[PDB]
Design a protein around this motif. Structure first.
Motif, PDB file in Angstrom:
ATOM      1  N   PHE A 180     -44.014  45.198 143.289  1.00 52.97           N
ATOM      2  CA  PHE A 180     -44.950  44.527 142.405  1.00 52.97           C
ATOM      3  C   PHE A 180     -44.338  44.364 141.017  1.00 52.97           C
ATOM      4  CE2 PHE A 180     -48.273  44.564 145.514  1.00 52.97           C
ATOM      5  CZ  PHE A 180     -48.063  45.723 146.254  1.00 52.97           C
ATOM      6  N   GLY A 181     -44.239  43.116 140.569  1.00 49.17           N
ATOM      7  CA  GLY A 181     -43.668  42.810 139.260  1.00 49.17           C
ATOM      8  C   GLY A 181     -44.738  42.882 138.189  1.00 49.17           C
ATOM      9  N   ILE A 182     -44.553  42.123 137.110  1.00 46.88           N
ATOM     10  CA  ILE A 182     -45.556  42.075 136.053  1.00 46.88           C
ATOM     11  C   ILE A 182     -46.871  41.538 136.642  1.00 46.88           C
ATOM     12  CG2 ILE A 182     -44.767  39.796 135.153  1.00 46.88           C
ATOM     13  CD1 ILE A 182     -46.155  42.770 133.043  1.00 46.88           C
ATOM     14  N   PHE A 183     -47.978  42.217 136.345  1.00 47.98           N
ATOM     15  CA  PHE A 183     -49.287  41.872 136.902  1.00 47.98           C
ATOM     16  C   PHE A 183     -49.681  40.424 136.619  1.00 47.98           C
ATOM     17  CE2 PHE A 183     -49.918  43.592 132.642  1.00 47.98           C
ATOM     18  CZ  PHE A 183     -50.762  42.652 132.047  1.00 47.98           C
TER      19      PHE A 183
ATOM     20  N   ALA B 152     -52.516  42.939 141.042  1.00 41.95           N
ATOM     21  CA  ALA B 152     -51.185  43.177 141.579  1.00 41.95           C
ATOM     22  C   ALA B 152     -50.451  41.874 141.849  1.00 41.95           C
ATOM     23  CB  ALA B 152     -51.270  44.003 142.860  1.00 41.95           C
TER      24      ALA B 152
ATOM     25  N   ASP C 136     -48.275  40.502 144.064  1.00 39.21           N
ATOM     26  CA  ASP C 136     -47.766  40.709 145.418  1.00 39.21           C
ATOM     27  C   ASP C 136     -46.784  39.592 145.770  1.00 39.21           C
ATOM     28  OD1 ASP C 136     -47.442  41.906 147.917  1.00 39.21           O
ATOM     29  OD2 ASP C 136     -49.316  41.129 148.743  1.00 39.21           O
TER      30      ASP C 136
ATOM     31  N   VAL D  59     -43.548  49.581 141.604  1.00 37.77           N
ATOM     32  CA  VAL D  59     -44.141  48.779 140.535  1.00 37.77           C
ATOM     33  C   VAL D  59     -43.395  48.866 139.198  1.00 37.77           C
ATOM     34  CG1 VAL D  59     -45.891  50.586 140.030  1.00 37.77           C
ATOM     35  CG2 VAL D  59     -46.337  48.176 139.366  1.00 37.77           C
ATOM     36  N   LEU D  60     -43.282  47.716 138.535  1.00 42.12           N
ATOM     37  CA  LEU D  60     -42.743  47.619 137.186  1.00 42.12           C
ATOM     38  C   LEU D  60     -43.728  48.206 136.175  1.00 42.12           C
ATOM     39  CD1 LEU D  60     -40.712  46.153 135.014  1.00 42.12           C
ATOM     40  CD2 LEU D  60     -42.353  44.266 135.154  1.00 42.12           C
ATOM     41  N   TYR D  61     -43.241  49.113 135.331  1.00 43.07           N
ATOM     42  CA  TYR D  61     -44.013  49.544 134.165  1.00 43.07           C
ATOM     43  C   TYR D  61     -44.214  48.357 133.216  1.00 43.07           C
ATOM     44  CZ  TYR D  61     -44.422  54.458 135.286  1.00 43.07           C
ATOM     45  OH  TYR D  61     -44.785  55.650 135.865  1.00 43.07           O
ATOM     46  N   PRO D  62     -45.484  48.007 132.937  1.00 42.88           N
ATOM     47  CA  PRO D  62     -45.820  46.790 132.194  1.00 42.88           C
ATOM     48  C   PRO D  62     -45.809  46.935 130.661  1.00 42.88           C
ATOM     49  CG  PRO D  62     -47.831  47.824 132.980  1.00 42.88           C
ATOM     50  CD  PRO D  62     -46.692  48.747 133.356  1.00 42.88           C
TER      51      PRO D  62
ATOM     52  N   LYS E 274     -52.845  45.315 155.017  1.00 42.06           N
ATOM     53  CA  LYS E 274     -52.473  44.925 153.659  1.00 42.06           C
ATOM     54  C   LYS E 274     -53.643  45.146 152.710  1.00 42.06           C
ATOM     55  CE  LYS E 274     -48.703  42.560 152.089  1.00 42.06           C
ATOM     56  NZ  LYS E 274     -48.180  42.637 150.699  1.00 42.06           N
TER      57      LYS E 274
ATOM     58  N   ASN F 237     -55.338  42.068 146.582  1.00 45.00           N
ATOM     59  CA  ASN F 237     -54.621  42.143 145.297  1.00 45.00           C
ATOM     60  C   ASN F 237     -55.414  42.733 144.129  1.00 45.00           C
ATOM     61  OD1 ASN F 237     -52.231  41.278 146.428  1.00 45.00           O
ATOM     62  ND2 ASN F 237     -52.453  39.149 145.749  1.00 45.00           N
TER      63      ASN F 237
ATOM     64  N   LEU G 172     -58.522  47.700 141.309  1.00 44.25           N
ATOM     65  CA  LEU G 172     -58.386  47.015 140.023  1.00 44.25           C
ATOM     66  C   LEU G 172     -59.614  46.165 139.700  1.00 44.25           C
ATOM     67  CD1 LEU G 172     -54.625  45.904 140.285  1.00 44.25           C
ATOM     68  CD2 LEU G 172     -55.533  47.471 138.547  1.00 44.25           C
TER      69      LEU G 172
ATOM     70  N   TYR H 267     -53.609  51.723 135.522  1.00 40.79           N
ATOM     71  CA  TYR H 267     -53.019  50.587 136.236  1.00 40.79           C
ATOM     72  C   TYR H 267     -51.994  51.005 137.291  1.00 40.79           C
ATOM     73  CZ  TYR H 267     -49.812  46.648 137.084  1.00 40.79           C
ATOM     74  OH  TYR H 267     -48.985  45.714 137.666  1.00 40.79           O
ATOM     75  N   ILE H 268     -51.048  51.864 136.906  1.00 41.76           N
ATOM     76  CA  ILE H 268     -49.966  52.281 137.808  1.00 41.76           C
ATOM     77  C   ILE H 268     -50.519  52.958 139.063  1.00 41.76           C
ATOM     78  CG2 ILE H 268     -47.884  53.753 138.090  1.00 41.76           C
ATOM     79  CD1 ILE H 268     -47.278  51.306 136.392  1.00 41.76           C
TER      80      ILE H 268
ATOM     81  N   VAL I 228     -52.121  50.577 141.635  1.00 40.42           N
ATOM     82  CA  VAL I 228     -51.138  49.892 142.468  1.00 40.42           C
ATOM     83  C   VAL I 228     -50.579  50.853 143.517  1.00 40.42           C
ATOM     84  CG1 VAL I 228     -48.927  48.664 142.509  1.00 40.42           C
ATOM     85  CG2 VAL I 228     -50.578  48.224 140.674  1.00 40.42           C
TER      86      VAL I 228
ATOM     87  N   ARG J  81     -52.677  51.523 146.741  1.00 43.35           N
ATOM     88  CA  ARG J  81     -52.721  50.498 147.785  1.00 43.35           C
ATOM     89  C   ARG J  81     -52.253  51.061 149.126  1.00 43.35           C
ATOM     90  NH1 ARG J  81     -52.480  44.955 146.496  1.00 43.35           N
ATOM     91  NH2 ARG J  81     -50.988  44.789 148.241  1.00 43.35           N
TER      92      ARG J  81
END
Ligand SMILES: OC[C@H]1O[C@@]2(CC(c3ccccc3)=NO2)[C@H](O)[C@@H](O)[C@@H]1O
Ligand SMILES: OC[C@H]1O[C@@]2(CC(c3ccccc3)=NO2)[C@H](O)[C@@H](O)[C@@H]1O
Lengths: 810, 810
Positions: free
Chosen positions: A152-155, A168, A170, A261-264, B236, B239, B243, B245-246, B249, B252
């Motif tokens: 999961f990248g930037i939300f 997320a 996705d 997941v990326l820390y945002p 699955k 999304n 939600l 934050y971390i 995710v 899930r």
């Protein structure tokens, strides 16, 4: 259609069409009867991907045969965006694919919109890494990007009731056609455990193992047949992990969460264990891969001749003690030799001076997670401080200031100090920023080792940020000066001879109007929002942060509204004010700023007296793909950070290249942009760094500005009384309180100059011809800000390699 | 090389070679310089997969155009094994691919060994589903297998210190070239929530949503160009799930755990919430898919004419109340009409009579997880019991015996009772088993609805279980009687006319010897174990369970050892005794049995006096791919369950087809196997079901056998004293205690007859010619046990469809 998009030869078009149909059948297992636009996108992506593979295989075998010095760019963030159009551009396939798809009864631009962004970054830092990869490939460097494959990248940002909601990202749901999993190159990474001292050195034992599985993505250079690799690691549990039975299998998730997941966080340090695990994960896997490749070329004296490691901020700083660990504990080198190799191999780029963004890891966390690395860090610190003590005898305070270990409530390791000690080069990212490093936060280090400190002003790739996103502008330029400028942006200076050319003036303004119309149409189709395409497009897009001063923009917007309400029948230059950007989920004030922006829009956009003279729009889900749409459409670029806070900025450069004028402070790269274009061609306002320093010495009192500026007082009274939130009168009390009593970024101090400067903007916009002539002078002097220039400087001045524009055989 | 493997035409071989090289380049992104055997496997798999796609697309469009009745086979288990060779066999590509790879400098059999088993089952039940899919495609039925795509299948078994160790079966690590993800057909599944009663019926609200993403795998029929689909669902998270934050995710994982791992229980019910979630997950997603396909053909009266749902045991029993839920709550049908449709659509297959294997779900679990389904189950029960009360007035105990709701400490739902009530057909899986159902556990139900109860004797596919695993035998048969038997196994009866044919006798024995040599070589190469290829291969492979009586086999082995030690210089027929199978991780006694087997081997295999006369080997990690190796090599098939406990067995049929003789009890399908071959050609021993019943009435006293059989006493004394575990004298105390005091399966009661029968086996083996003649009589009468026969019976007698051997156009 247009020249810069390449040839559409009969053979090529026929071949692309047949390979498209082949992929739809064999790869996607569909026929034209049940296929959807998404199926068509994937058929196209696979067709274009096929053209990369030959070049990708031959590039990598070329590096094996030639054995050049390899450049390793380590980053926790790579903000790549979409890949389809970029690949076509760099392979000269755009027109051919456009033709092929057109003959199949499909619109290629519709297909392009289906691709998910690869949003593996927060903003500027991650996007810099992406532009750098593009430039390194275009300049023929044997370069590898190494990072983490976040699931999961930037939300994705949704706006609900004027508030930011997160969901997320996705991005892998439908698959990623660009990556190639390489499970055969899986490497182990160790955590926890303990240090055992033997007859023959230290041993790190009783560790927990997580596997690092690499996924490779091709990075094509611009029409040189070079295809480099971005290798991203994914976390995997070993098969004997936790091995009741069911729970043990379910608990594999704990290990695999490392790459989830990326820390945002943009410009903010969050000292969480999971983030530390991510940082070591990428470092440990990457270094093993580097050493393997080096051995597959005993003699580590030549290591720095064959390997350069660039640290993208302090995030991969553990590379320094990890390299020492491998050389000392595993390869059995003596400390002094290992250290010499490490220093000559590593270089460090600092990207920010904001205190809350700097990584300072609690000793207790490193003690538990990485016991051997802590020991090595302690040894590095002792030897370093012995050097400082020898150079500055008796200066005890310098010793405490320069220490890698910070004493206090909780002992911490200063990762920036670690990076300076263990690198042969340290650079900032704009001239003003690099000077600030030498004068303030790293002054002590500069005094000890002046030769280490350098500047490398940031840049952007003209492939993505001109040819891809603004083909109309690229074409009118190419018509006059040819195509060479796309990989030699300094050639844009030739456009200075066209500033009085009536045909060129017309074409530049025409391209801008077309971009504005297209974007106005995009907004109606996808968001049902209505804007005047004849208005001045006033745009501030970037992450939401107090230092970036979206709030200052808000104050100007309210000023304009109030002035219209005071004198409704007076003519004003119509504006569409667009603000977009994500707030970090835990950043309360940034979330409040978003709500303020939407709240202002709610009032301004529905006031009958205002009409089409002023519109305020919040651009939802700002990301690379949206940047590619809005930047070409912009008239005015808002770059209004408090002097000394924006290290460089890169959005600024994107706007300059695409025919927007800039209103900005003398901060980051704005300074060099104004220098290149001439100050007469830039809308400069506000405090300089020295003026901020003077105010800090005196003490910043916001009340003073409130008392002396009646227009400012009105705005604050409106905010406090509930003018912009009638049903919740005290909604913005936190914003008012911060502005009045604890504003670190001096919003009020720049208000008067800002509003005055904005009046000068409106005045110039009333004269279309002179506006466009100033635009031409900006575009023409934007050449310095190509990432090709930036990378050539890193190559020559840090890495010790020569860039090449020579083609590899196709 | 051999005829049954098809033609190797010049055009085909040339085309396969070029497509192999294409995939290695474009798909795998490798060249011959760096490619590994695994890369070569994948290049071959992709090449063969390409040949499926055309047929797959045209088969599915054919069903859309013809709109036949669709058969839906719902199972929690599909034990598929490897796919590469099976696909080549069914497409007639084996010789062509063998030639193509040979010309490329590769050995195809080496490449085949690289493929992971698709181990999405425990044993017999899952493997039956797999054979059924093969037969349904071969018989041209519009059939769909529906299940769960487990990330982890049946665990890999390692033997360490003689004990079973489990590790995760990470079968998807390198990817699965056979499946096609269909994210576009993702469907929501609901859990928890509450029931709200409105003016217009009940509503199920406030639910938690998990997404079901389908993956499709092709199922090719035997040389008829039919390719059916197995659709497996993966879990699955939505999304917006959860939600800070971390953590949201990361959480899930909780939703996605539904499809993470196969429950490793064979014939045992574990009442865990996660398993219940799995069962509803597959049912809910599948039923939505069925209804969608039916609507895309309002009038649900024709639903049973176009849809058949087969329930593979009670695991997907929630299909009954789920179908009622959709028809009543969503489609607004009246109860009575919905029930009529449901009954006519659903049919139920029972696979076991062991009390501990039957699903009885606690009411409190269904109350929380599936509140609406519980309400529907209660309503079904009330209406059903009203019918029983009308048919048997005043019989109050019948009402409590037949109730779907079981009262006690915890109230439970009997899922078998639910299935009988809501199905138009109920079948057992062998004649003896089906009779047991009518006489004992479902006697009350048979009395109420006799027309519902049927038999469908199990079968195995002769494609995988003869042509694939034993090409040598397939060929010598084809030489005499042609190739038609591969899809018409009854034709093997023609081999009866060759029982006195001296050339055929020689060839059958030759093929067996070759298989034995190959397997003896496999054991040395992969496990460094040494065996005599001239010895009688005595094989018991199946899951470890008390009812299967691996312990009885152990007692015979020790008997043989003791007899050799008593008279060392007396000749005995040399044996290699091979036992293999997995124990469920939580099944203590089964794990102890494994340790006993290895402990016996440790003593027997290292006794110098024994020599090569007796070897005991535990076959590690028994699975479909190992079955394909060991079954063709076997001389003696051990099928020795206590009469009335093995519902059918299918391993028994595999051994019969491949030229092994059978030592067995009159249990499950053994009875029909003996009937087909003639009792003179089977080694039958021990108690019949009636004899077990008599002993139960009297009371089973194991001490009686201990007191009266001196050879048995010796073994028990050896076990108790520590003869087989010198360093841990009391290691097997649990085994001895169970045998002496609480043996549900009467091991001692069959001991004398078993040993006596085994002597008759050894006597026959001394006469190779007569051994082989009896083998020929077994192979020749194995035709009834083709799964083509089984499926034809389901088709005609339950589903109401006619099978077809007609080819679809290629
Ligand atoms: O050099 C690339 C860019 O780097 C920053 C720094 C940054 C960042 C992001 C995450 C963590 C720490 C810093 N994002 O943007 C700077 O804020 C920005 O001015 C600069 O242009
Ligand atoms: O019908 C297929 C086979 O089904 C069983 C039953 C079974 C099983 C597996 C899991 C849960 C419940 C029952 N595995 O094997 C039976 O034990 C076996 O005799 C039969 O051949």
């Amino acid at each position: 259609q247009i020249s810069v998009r390449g040839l559409a030869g009969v053979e090529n078009v026929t071949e692309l069409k047949k390979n498209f149909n082949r992929h739809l059948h064999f790869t996607l297992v569909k026929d034209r009867n049940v296929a959807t636009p998404r199926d068509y996108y994937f058929a196209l992506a696979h067709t274009v991907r096929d053209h990369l593979v030959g070049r990708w295989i031959r590039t990598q075998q070329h590096y094996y045969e030639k054995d050049p010095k390899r450049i390793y760019y380590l980053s926790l963030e790579f903000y790549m965006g979409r890949t389809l159009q970029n690949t076509m551009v760099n392979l000269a396939l755009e027109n051919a694919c456009d033709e092929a798809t057109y003959q199949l009864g499909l619109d290629m631009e519709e297909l392009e919109e289906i691709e998910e962004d690869a949003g593996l970054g927060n903003g500027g830092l991650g996007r810099l890494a992406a532009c750098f990869l593009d430039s390194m490939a275009t300049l023929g460097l044997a370069a590898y990007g190494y990072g983490i494959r976040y699931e999961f990248g930037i939300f994705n940002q949704k706006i609900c009731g004027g508030w930011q909601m997160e969901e997320a990202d996705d991005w892998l749901r439908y698959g990623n056609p660009w990556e190639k999993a390489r499970p055969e190159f899986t490497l182990p990474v160790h955590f926890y455990g303990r240090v055992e001292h033997t007859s023959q050195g230290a041993k790190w034992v009783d560790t927990q193992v997580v596997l690092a599985m690499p996924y490779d993505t091709p990075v094509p250079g611009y029409r040189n047949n070079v295809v480099n690799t971005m290798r991203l690691w994914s976390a995997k549990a070993p098969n004997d992990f936790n091995l009741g039975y069911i729970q043990a299998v379910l608990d594999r998730n704990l290990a695999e969460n490392i790459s989830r997941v990326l820390y945002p966080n943009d410009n903010f340090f969050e000292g969480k264990e999971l983030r530390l695990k991510q940082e070591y994960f990428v470092v440990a896997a990457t270094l093993q891969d580097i050493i393997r490749r080096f051995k597959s070329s005993t003699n580590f004296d030549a290591f720095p001749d064959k390997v350069a490691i660039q640290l993208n901020d302090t995030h991969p700083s553990l590379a320094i003690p990890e390299l020492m660990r491998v050389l000392v504990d595993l390869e059995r080198l003596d400390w002094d030799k290992a250290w010499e190799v490490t220093v000559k191999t590593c270089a460090y780029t600092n990207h920010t001076v904001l205190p809350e963004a700097l990584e300072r890891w609690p000793v207790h966390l490193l003690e538990t997670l990485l016991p051997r690395h802590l020991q090595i860090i302690y040894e590095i610190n002792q030897r370093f401080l012995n050097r400082v003590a020898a150079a500055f005898p008796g200066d005890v305070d310098r010793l405490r200031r320069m220490s890698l270990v910070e004493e206090g409530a909780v002992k911490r390791i200063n990762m920036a100090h670690l990076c300076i000690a263990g690198s042969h080069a340290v650079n900032g990212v704009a001239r003003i920023h690099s000077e600030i490093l030498k004068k303030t936060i790293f002054k002590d280090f500069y005094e000890l080792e002046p030769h280490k400190f350098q500047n490398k002003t940031n840049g952007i790739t003209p492939r993505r940020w001109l040819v891809l996103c603004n083909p109309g502008l690229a074409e009118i330029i190419a018509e006059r000066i040819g195509e060479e400028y796309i990989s030699d942006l300094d050639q844009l200076r030739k456009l200075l001879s066209y500033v009085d050319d009536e045909a060129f003036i017309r074409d530049v303004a025409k391209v801008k109007q077309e971009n504005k119309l297209k974007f106005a149409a995009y907004l109606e189709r996808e968001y049902k929002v209505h804007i005047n395409p004849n208005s001045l497009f006033d745009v501030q897009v970037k992450r939401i942060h107090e230092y970036k001063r979206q709030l200052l923009n808000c104050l100007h917007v309210i000023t304009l509204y109030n002035r219209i309400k005071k004198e409704p029948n007076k003519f004003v230059v119509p504006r569409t004010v667009m603000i977009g950007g994500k707030a970090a989920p835990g950043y309360h004030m940034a979330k409040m700023i978003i709500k303020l922006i939407t709240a202002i829009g709610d009032v301004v956009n529905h006031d009958p007296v205002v009409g089409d003279r002023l519109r305020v729009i919040f651009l939802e889900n700002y990301r690379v793909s949206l940047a590619e749409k809005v930047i070409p459409a912009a008239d005015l670029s808002e770059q209004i950070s408090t002097a000394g806070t924006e290290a460089s900025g890169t959005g600024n450069m994107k706007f300059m290249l695409n025919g927007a004028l800039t209103i900005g402070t003398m901060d980051g790269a704005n300074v060099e942009m104004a220098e290149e274009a001439g100050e007469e061609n830039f809308f400069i306002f506000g405090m300089r760094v020295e003026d901020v320093d003077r105010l800090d010495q005196r003490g910043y009192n916001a009340q003073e500005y409130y008392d002396r500026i009646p227009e400012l007082r009105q705005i604050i009274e409106q905010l406090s009384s509930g003018f912009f939130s009638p049903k919740q009168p005290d909604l913005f009390k936190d914003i008012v309180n911060m502005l009045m009593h604890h504003d670190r970024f001096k919003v009020f101090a720049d208000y008067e100059e800002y509003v005055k400067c904005q009046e000068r903007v409106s005045a110039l916009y009333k004269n279309p011809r002179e506006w466009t002539r100033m635009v031409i002078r900006n575009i023409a002097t934007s050449g310095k800000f190509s990432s090709d220039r930036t990378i050539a400087q890193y190559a020559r001045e840090i890495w010790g390699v020569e860039p090449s524009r020579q083609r590899l055989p196709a």
